[PDB]
Motif scaffolding. Structure first.
Motif, PDB file in Angstrom:
ATOM      1  N   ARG A 192       0.821  -1.169   0.112  1.00 25.60           N
ATOM      2  CA  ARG A 192      -0.089  -0.002   0.080  1.00 25.60           C
ATOM      3  C   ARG A 192       0.765   1.279  -0.032  1.00 25.60           C
ATOM      4  N   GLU A 193       1.961   1.332   0.834  1.00 22.96           N
ATOM      5  CA  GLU A 193       2.756   2.494   1.028  1.00 22.96           C
ATOM      6  C   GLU A 193       3.393   2.823  -0.410  1.00 22.96           C
ATOM      7  N   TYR A 194       3.796   1.859  -1.096  1.00 23.29           N
ATOM      8  CA  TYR A 194       4.656   2.001  -2.319  1.00 23.29           C
ATOM      9  C   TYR A 194       3.648   2.325  -3.515  1.00 23.29           C
ATOM     10  N   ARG A 195       2.485   1.783  -3.459  1.00 27.10           N
ATOM     11  CA  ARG A 195       1.451   1.895  -4.321  1.00 27.10           C
ATOM     12  C   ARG A 195       1.063   3.338  -4.235  1.00 27.10           C
ATOM     13  N   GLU A 196       0.708   4.047  -2.866  1.00 30.28           N
ATOM     14  CA  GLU A 196       0.586   5.205  -2.638  1.00 30.28           C
ATOM     15  C   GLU A 196       1.704   6.376  -2.982  1.00 30.28           C
ATOM     16  N   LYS A 197       2.756   5.860  -3.206  1.00 29.24           N
ATOM     17  CA  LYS A 197       4.034   6.909  -3.503  1.00 29.24           C
ATOM     18  C   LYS A 197       4.055   6.900  -4.874  1.00 29.24           C
ATOM     19  N   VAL A 198       3.791   6.093  -5.838  1.00 31.87           N
ATOM     20  CA  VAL A 198       3.505   6.113  -7.068  1.00 31.87           C
ATOM     21  C   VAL A 198       2.224   6.904  -7.521  1.00 31.87           C
ATOM     22  N   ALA A 229      17.194   3.173  -5.200  1.00 32.65           N
ATOM     23  CA  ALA A 229      17.167   4.013  -4.125  1.00 32.65           C
ATOM     24  C   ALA A 229      16.858   3.158  -2.892  1.00 32.65           C
ATOM     25  N   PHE A 230      15.932   2.108  -3.178  1.00 32.81           N
ATOM     26  CA  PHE A 230      15.575   1.109  -1.846  1.00 32.81           C
ATOM     27  C   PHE A 230      16.801   0.185  -1.638  1.00 32.81           C
ATOM     28  N   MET A 231      17.459  -0.123  -2.709  1.00 29.81           N
ATOM     29  CA  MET A 231      18.583  -1.105  -2.333  1.00 29.81           C
ATOM     30  C   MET A 231      19.922  -0.085  -1.713  1.00 29.81           C
ATOM     31  N   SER A 283      14.941   5.822   7.738  1.00 32.28           N
ATOM     32  CA  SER A 283      13.624   5.503   8.546  1.00 32.28           C
ATOM     33  C   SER A 283      12.949   4.452   8.286  1.00 32.28           C
ATOM     34  N   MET A 284      13.304   3.776   7.008  1.00 29.31           N
ATOM     35  CA  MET A 284      12.640   2.459   6.622  1.00 29.31           C
ATOM     36  C   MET A 284      13.191   1.168   7.085  1.00 29.31           C
ATOM     37  N   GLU A 285      12.472   0.149   7.557  1.00 32.51           N
ATOM     38  CA  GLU A 285      13.012  -0.951   7.874  1.00 32.51           C
ATOM     39  C   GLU A 285      13.919  -1.882   6.683  1.00 32.51           C
ATOM     40  N   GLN A 342      11.770  -5.503   0.302  1.00 30.99           N
ATOM     41  CA  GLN A 342      10.364  -5.703  -0.399  1.00 30.99           C
ATOM     42  C   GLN A 342       9.973  -4.893  -1.478  1.00 30.99           C
ATOM     43  N   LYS A 343      10.268  -3.756  -0.943  1.00 33.57           N
ATOM     44  CA  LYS A 343       9.827  -2.591  -1.897  1.00 33.57           C
ATOM     45  C   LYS A 343      10.769  -2.500  -3.189  1.00 33.57           C
ATOM     46  N   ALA A 344      11.837  -2.963  -3.025  1.00 31.88           N
ATOM     47  CA  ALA A 344      12.943  -3.270  -4.211  1.00 31.88           C
ATOM     48  C   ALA A 344      12.194  -4.279  -5.353  1.00 31.88           C
TER      49      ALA A 344
HETATM   50 CL   LIG Z   1       7.194   3.734  -0.369  1.00 33.69          CL
END
Ligand SMILES: [Cl-]
Ligand SMILES: Cc1cccc(C)c1N(C(=O)CN)C(C)C
Ligand SMILES: Cc1cccc(C)c1N(C(=O)CN)C(C)C
Ligand SMILES: [Cl-]
Ligand SMILES: [Mg+2]
Ligand SMILES: [Mg+2]
Ligand SMILES: [Mg+2]
Ligand SMILES: [Mg+2]
Ligand SMILES: [Mg+2]
Ligand SMILES: [Mg+2]
Lengths: 9, 230, 230, 9
Positions: B81-87, C29-31, C5-7, C13-15
């Motif tokens: 959800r967070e990443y979808r919200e970011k995009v 950026a995530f990696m 600030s992100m785990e 997961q976001k990558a």
């Molecule tokens: Cl995000």
């Protein structure tokens, strides 16, 4: 659905 | 803006280079800078503006659809959800930027049918892209903003342009997509695509070979949609 | 950094989500954020890091080549040079970022052959990308940095990995490309590709079907280059 | 010239 190309004459 | 120090002609030249390099974010920033010089845009410059932002928002829309699909499956942690919200937020920012350029002051300075219809179509398009991701309190108002812009463009185009005009055709195509995908009006979508196609077919005989190629390309998109929709 | 600030697990997961969405700048950026947590990377995480930045720099390299070609033709106003310089500077910044991650502190913490060779290969790769655009006072030093990194990786890989190991093969492939395209050593390039291919061919019999598929994929790239080069 | 894929096993 297909929409329009950006460039139109 | 960061483009305030660059000549208008240099911004246009670099937009064309960016297009060749498939650097569409750069292309959009250069064309935003050109718009912000305050002079009206030529036909070629309007097309550069549209190509740039259509490609930028197109990448965001494709990404949003991938992520939304993953998110909906996950609902059959917060990261999807967070990443979808970011995009989604980045997409909305691009749409807001384009709409701001149209409102300040491209549309109000556009007096000729070709420019005014082109810009009003763009306004409908970027409200339609906002509508694709909208979900509460404002989805209805966003949809009606898209509809209103498309409708004004349609009214001008029917009075001032021949039925084969590529801007008129691309407008009708996108308004029909609005009806089918956004407004839950598949019958309106089909009717508009059919009437648009048939009226253009009856006007092809007036065109040169090059104009005929331009018009028939968009007519085929209308036909492709009718084939999908019926 | 903005990812502080992100785990770590959320960044990974976001990558993976960004990869699915073909959002490679986000993926990088995530990696980068995951690396900066300070823990070593697993095999899968190293591959995510590489995929992300390879795709980012690949778009910049393709754009730089388009613009450089236009610029060289123009030399058979300043805008073409300016915009090529802009893309070039952005490319150099991405390479510097990757090299900084390898130096602080991925390489020094990498004790196993698979990780250490992977990272040293990456160091050679991003100095090679810098070399592709370099032109004065430092082109020679950039080339020798690429060579030195590749050579250390080669020495470890030959002592510690079987000839079919995909990391060893991809390293040899890229070092051969370095020889051919950067160091003006086509014969060294051809010799390395040939010996690498033949030694891998003789070790295929030891592999499972899935490992054989991984190894033969990179061997075919060696063969494709030999076909181009001879 | 072809170079290596990013992802290597
Ligand atoms: Cl995000
Ligand atoms: C003129 C036209 C418009 C839209 C689609 C098509 C395929 C056409 N053509 C037809 O004859 C349609 N009856 C040409 C191109 C052959
Ligand atoms: C094993 C191998 C490695 C690199 C390229 C190829 C085409 C192959 N093969 C050969 O038999 C080469 N003699 C298989 C896949 C058929
Ligand atoms: Cl520039
Ligand atoms: Mg001026
Ligand atoms: Mg939202
Ligand atoms: Mg019906
Ligand atoms: Mg933690
Ligand atoms: Mg430079
Ligand atoms: Mg020879």
């Amino acid at each position: 659905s297909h929409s329009s190309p950006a460039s139109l004459q | 803006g960061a483009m305030g120090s660059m000549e208008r002609a240099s911004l246009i030249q670099k937009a064309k280079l960016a297009e060749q390099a498939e650097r569409y974010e750069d292309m959009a920033a250069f064309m935003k800078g050109a718009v912000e010089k305050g002079e009206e845009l030529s036909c070629e410059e309007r097309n550069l503006l549209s190509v740039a932002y259509k490609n930028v928002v197109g990448g965001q829309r494709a990404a949003w659809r991938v992520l939304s699909s993953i998110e909906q499956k996950s609902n059959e942690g917060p990261e999807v959800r967070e990443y979808r919200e970011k995009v989604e937020t980045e997409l909305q920012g691009v749409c807001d930027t384009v709409l701001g350029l149209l409102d300040s002051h491209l549309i109000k300075e556009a007096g000729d049918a070709e420019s005014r219809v082109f810009y009003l179509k763009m306004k409908g398009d970027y409200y339609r892209y906002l509508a694709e991701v909208a979900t509460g309190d404002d989805k209805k108002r966003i949809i009606d903003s898209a509809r209103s812009a498309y409708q004004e463009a349609m009214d001008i185009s029917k009075k001032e342009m021949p039925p084969t005009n590529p801007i008129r055709l691309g407008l009708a195509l996108n308004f029909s997509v609005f009806h089918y995908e956004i407004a839950n009006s598949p019958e309106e979508a089909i009717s508009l695509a059919k009437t648009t196609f048939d009226e253009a077919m009856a006007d092809l005989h007036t065109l040169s070979e090059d104009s005929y190629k331009d018009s028939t390309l968009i007519m085929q998109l209308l036909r492709d949609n009718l084939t999908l929709w019926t």
